[PDB]
């Protein structure tokens, strides 16, 4: 049954693809669709387990850990590979149920004192930046030795879910730099996704890649300069989005269909038919 | 086929296509049918896709492709009434309905010119027991000289239940407009705003020399498109932008 195995394998690959492309705030609905369409719960819960985790890490799903005030983001940088994720702010790991989006079983996690003060300073600066620039944003900052370099990875998430009004949106941004005095390269990606689906399906998908440089000196000064780069680039991106919206409304849209013919009257269908 | 009265998979498929990115409808629809091949005909008919343009090489005119003028892998031209590639037994309208289809195509080509001043249109009709149904297709792309690109697809399905003894008919119009805007500028990076809205109207009318089917249908399509255009402007450039700025 080689041909049948290829078909179940392809069906699960399709199901996983659909699940990972669910809009923000609509995972459950897409999952239910895919489950009923695949009609094989075993193929699904094993063959698509990776899709649940991939979606959550791709979306920077924020999660609340009981006993700690600030939420942590589920990201690829916190994946311990064993079902647990890292909270680099509270120096703990926690089990994460990707389907129920539940954090449990906090346990101390040992981290490297090398990157610790650089990470903490960037986190403190980033949290203050997010509190001021987002209505209800969350952020998580990691510090790792990666392919041979001390690296800081800052992640920001912000969503608004209003399914009763048939729309959901999410902002994600990710920022990386290596602690390489005197000057380090900054790489980042900014992402927006908005879904409106009252009597239709309209989606904004946007992303911007960033390359910049930051002066690396002390932990606290570098952290200040890093957030400055973040603020400048996120503000520029958001302003560019609005300016493009304006051009789309007042130019692009009008080159498609007119409001009325050049006659400035509705159509005389008797004249069209004679 | 609509073979099942209770079909939870069909409902889930349509729900799913309201949620996956409309930028990937074509690939998603094909993968979706792989999952539920027995819904192939239902999904091809019910999931709207961006319209493709073909060239009728007999008359030298473009026409629009959709499921409604397809048979196998061949598509029927509204201008020549022939399938490309050739098909010896393709679905064809009746001789009487083809005459109406020709007039409708001429009429909506004028509608296209007046409201869109460009683009391409096509009308395809097919017979029903006590009436007929049709699709009116319009595709218009914006200026390719511009960094911000746009494209408009109209998909109007009309179902006409005729009551000739009363010289009236009942019209049901289901209209989708797919609106696509895209740019890769320095400031915003990549920005893709795309998708569709669908609305429906029904109305009874007299059918006569002074108000024939094409005039009854034209007025409905005109009213619907004028309304949808205004809703699209509000939803795309008002609502989705306000959502963005509510995120940050």
């Amino acid at each position: 049954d080689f041909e049948d195995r290829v078909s179940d394998e392809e069906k699960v690959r399709i199901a996983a693809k659909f699940i990972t492309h669910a809009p923000p705030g609509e995972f459950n609905e897409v999952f239910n669709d895919v489950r009923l369409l695949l009609n094989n719960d075993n193929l699904l819960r094993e063959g698509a387990a990776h899709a649940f985790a991939q979606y959550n890490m791709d979306q920077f799903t924020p999660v609340k850990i009981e006993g700690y005030d600030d939420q942590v983001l589920i990201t690829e940088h916190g994946d311990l590979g064993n079902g647990r994720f890292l909270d680099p702010r509270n120096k703990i790991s926690f089990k994460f149920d990707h389907l129920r989006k539940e954090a449990s079983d906090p346990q101390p996690e040992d981290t490297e004192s090398a990157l610790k003060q650089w990470r903490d300073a960037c986190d403190s600066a980033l949290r203050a930046y997010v509190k001021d620039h987002y209505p209800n944003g969350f952020c998580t900052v990691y510090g790792k030795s990666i392919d041979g370099q001390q690296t800081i990875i800052a992640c920001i998430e912000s969503h608004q879910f209003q399914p009763k009004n048939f729309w959901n949106g999410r902002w994600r941004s990710e920022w990386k730099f290596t602690i390489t005095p005197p000057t380090a390269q900054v790489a980042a990606v900014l992402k927006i996704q908005v879904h409106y689906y009252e009597d239709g399906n309209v989606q904004l998908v946007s992303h911007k890649d960033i390359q910049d440089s930051v002066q690396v000196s002390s932990d606290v000064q570098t952290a200040k300069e890093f957030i400055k780069i973040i603020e400048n680039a996120e503000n520029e991106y958001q302003t560019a989005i609005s300016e493009n919206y304006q051009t789309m409304s007042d130019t692009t849209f009008k080159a498609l269909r007119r409001q009325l013919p050049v006659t400035r009257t509705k159509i005389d269908w008797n004249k069209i038919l004679s | 086929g609509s073979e099942f009265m209770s079909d939870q998979q069909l409902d889930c498929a349509l729900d799913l296509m309201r949620r996956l990115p409309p930028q990937q409808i074509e690939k998603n629809l094909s993968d979706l049918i792989d999952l539920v091949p027995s819904l192939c005909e239902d999904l091809l008919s019910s999931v709207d896709q961006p319209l493709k343009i073909a060239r009728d090489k007999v008359v030298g005119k473009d026409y629009l492709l959709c499921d409604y003028n397809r048979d196998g892998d061949s598509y029927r031209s509204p201008w020549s009434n022939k399938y490309d590639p050739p098909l010896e037994d393709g679905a064809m309208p009746s001789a009487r309905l083809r005459k109406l289809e020709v007039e409708a195509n001429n009429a909506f080509d004028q509608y296209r010119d007046l409201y869109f001043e460009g683009g391409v249109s096509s009308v395809y009709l097919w017979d029903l027991d006590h009436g007929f149904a049709g699709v009116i297709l319009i595709k218009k792309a914006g200026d390719g000289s511009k960094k911000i690109k746009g494209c408009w697809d109209s998909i109007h399905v009309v179902e006409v239940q005729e009551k000739s003894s009363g010289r009236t008919a009942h019209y049901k119009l289901t209209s989708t407009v797919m609106l696509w805007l895209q740019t890769n500028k320095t400031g915003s990076g990549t920005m893709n705003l795309g998708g569709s809205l669908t609305r429906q109207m029904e109305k009874d009318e007299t059918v006569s020399d002074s108000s024939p089917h094409i005039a009854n249908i034209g007025r409905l399509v005109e009213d619907m498109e004028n309304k949808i255009r205004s809703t699209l402007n509000e939803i795309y450039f008002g609502k989705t932008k306000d959502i963005v700025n509510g995120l940050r």
Binding site: - | L14, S46, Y68, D71, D73, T176, R199
Partner: peptide, 25 residues
């Protein structure tokens, strides 16, 4: 969600399917 397209008139019955989808039957 409700779907105007679910009951939207479908094209004629009994037409051949496209080849790329025939392979999925």
């Amino acid at each position: 969600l409700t779907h105007f397209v679910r009951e939207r008139a479908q094209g004629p019955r009994g037409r051949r399917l496209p080849a790329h989808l025939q392979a999925k039957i």
